[PDB]
């Protein structure tokens, strides 16, 4: 399925994913498209930050959902 | 040269603190240099830092209040958002600074940070993980460090 990830600029990043994809895997896809390391990504859906070891399905993130991406510097 | 307005703002904030002194922090200059303050905060009640007394160092930039003050602990503290150099991962000291914020409000937010850690955005990943998976152990070690270093 397809999901959308919006940055603070308003840029939408379109990703191909499955419900069983871990948050870490979604971040890896983000890194492939934008060059941003996973540890430096904060992914947010419906106001809740998404934990790396959890999955899209864990948060009930269904097809065509919009996630928000905030960046941190290396080391946090 | 830049710095005159910043000095005026610094004076205003000192005036604010004198008119409405907080109960659990103190802050101000410690010499001729008004751009360098010492701060002293109590760890919040209903936290493992309760009763601890922590020192901070504050350096105002010449373009204050456009840019935030630099604020760091000088007392060692065990906390997912504060590292061994005393740097503090707090939104309002970095990308979310507003010139409308004051030192008194910064000290309040640092208090809130101590009472409610943010393991979503750690400076110390090892500590954030302990906070998430074993709160009792986090609390014990935070208190041990408070006893050792904040007294």
Swiss-Prot record, chain A:
There is a cross-link at residue 76 (Glycyl lysine isopeptide (Gly-Lys) (interchain with K-? in acceptor proteins)). Changing residue 72 to G: No effect on ADP-ribosylation. Phosphorylated at Ser-65 by PINK1 during mitophagy. Phosphorylated ubiquitin specifically binds and activates parkin (PRKN), triggering mitophagy. Phosphorylation does not affect E1-mediated E2 charging of ubiquitin but affects discharging of E2 enzymes to form polyubiquitin chains. It also affects deubiquitination by deubiquitinase enzymes such as USP30. Mono-ADP-ribosylated at the C-terminus by PARP9, a component of the PPAR9-DTX3L complex. ADP-ribosylation requires processing by E1 and E2 enzymes and prevents ubiquitin conjugation to substrates such as histones. There is a cross-link at residues 6, 11, 27, 29, 33, 48, 63 (Glycyl lysine isopeptide (Lys-Gly) (interchain with G-Cter in ubiquitin)). It is a peripheral membrane protein. The modification (Microbial infection) ADP-ribosylthreonine is found at residue 66. Changing residue 72 to K: No effect on ADP-ribosylation. Residues 1-76 form the Ubiquitin-like domain. The record marks 68 as: Essential for function. Changing residue 65 to D: Phosphomimetic mutant that binds and activates PRKN. The modification Phosphoserine is found at residue 65. Exists either covalently attached to another protein, or free (unanchored). When covalently bound, it is conjugated to target proteins via an isopeptide bond either as a monomer (monoubiquitin), a polymer linked via different Lys residues of the ubiquitin (polyubiquitin chains) or a linear polymer linked via the initiator Met of the ubiquitin (linear polyubiquitin chains). It is found in: Cytoplasm; Nucleus; Mitochondrion outer membrane. The modification ADP-ribosylglycine is found at residue 76. The record marks 54, 72 as: Interacts with activating enzyme. This is Ubiquitin. Changing residue 65 to E: Phosphomimetic mutant that binds and activates PRKN.
UniProtKB/Swiss-Prot annotation, chain B:
Residues 5-151 form the UBC core domain. Pfam families: UQ_con. Its EC number is 2.3.2.23, 2.3.2.24. Changing residue 126 to K: Abolishes histone H3 ubiquitination. PROSITE patterns: UBC_1, UBC_2. Changing residue 94 to A: Abolishes histone H3 ubiquitination and decreases interaction with PHF7. Accepts ubiquitin from the E1 complex and catalyzes its covalent attachment to other proteins. Catalyzes 'Lys-48'-linked polyubiquitination. Mediates the selective degradation of short-lived and abnormal proteins. Functions in the E6/E6-AP-induced ubiquitination of p53/TP53. Mediates ubiquitination of PEX5 and SQSTM1 and autoubiquitination of STUB1 and TRAF6. Interacts with SCF (SKP1-CUL1-F-box protein) E3 ubiquitin ligase complex. Interacts with CNOT4 (via RING domain). Interacts with E3 ubiquitin-protein ligases CBLC, PJA1 and PJA2. Interacts with PDZRN3. Interacts with PPP1R11. Interacts with E3 ubiquitin-protein ligase PHF7; the interaction inhibits cleavage of PHF7 and promotes association of the complex with the nucleosome core particle. This is Ubiquitin-conjugating enzyme E2 D2. It comes from Homo sapiens (Human). The lineage of its organism: Eukaryota, Metazoa, Chordata, Craniata, Vertebrata. The gene is UBE2D2.
């Amino acid at each position: 399925m397809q999901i959308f990830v919006k940055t603070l600029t308003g840029k939408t990043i379109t990703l191909e994913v499955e419900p069983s994809d871990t948050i870490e895997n979604v971040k890896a896809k983000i890194q492939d498209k934008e060059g941003i390391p996973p540890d430096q990504q904060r992914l947010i859906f419906a106001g809740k930050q998404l934990e790396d070891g959890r999955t899209l399905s864990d948060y009930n993130i269904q097809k065509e959902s919009t996630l928000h991406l905030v960046l941190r510097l290396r080391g946090g | 040269p830049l710095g005159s307005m910043a000095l005026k703002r610094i004076h205003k904030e000192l005036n604010d603190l004198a008119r409405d002194p907080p109960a659990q922090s103190r802050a101000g200059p410690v010499g001729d240099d008004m751009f360098h303050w010492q701060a002293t905060i109590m760890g919040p009640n209903d936290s493992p830092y309760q009763g601890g007394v922590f020192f901070l160092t504050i350096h105002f930039p010449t373009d204050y209040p456009f840019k935030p003050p630099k604020v760091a602990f000088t007392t060692r503290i065990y906390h997912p958002n504060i590292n061994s150099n005393g740097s503090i991962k707090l939104d309002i000291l970095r990308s979310q600074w507003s010139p409308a914020l004051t030192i008194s409000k910064v000290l309040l937010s640092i208090s809130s940070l101590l009472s409610d850690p943010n393991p979503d955005d750690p400076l110390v990943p090892e500590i954030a993980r302990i906070y998430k998976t074993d709160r009792e152990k986090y609390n014990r070690i935070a208190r041990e460090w408070t006893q050792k270093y904040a007294m």
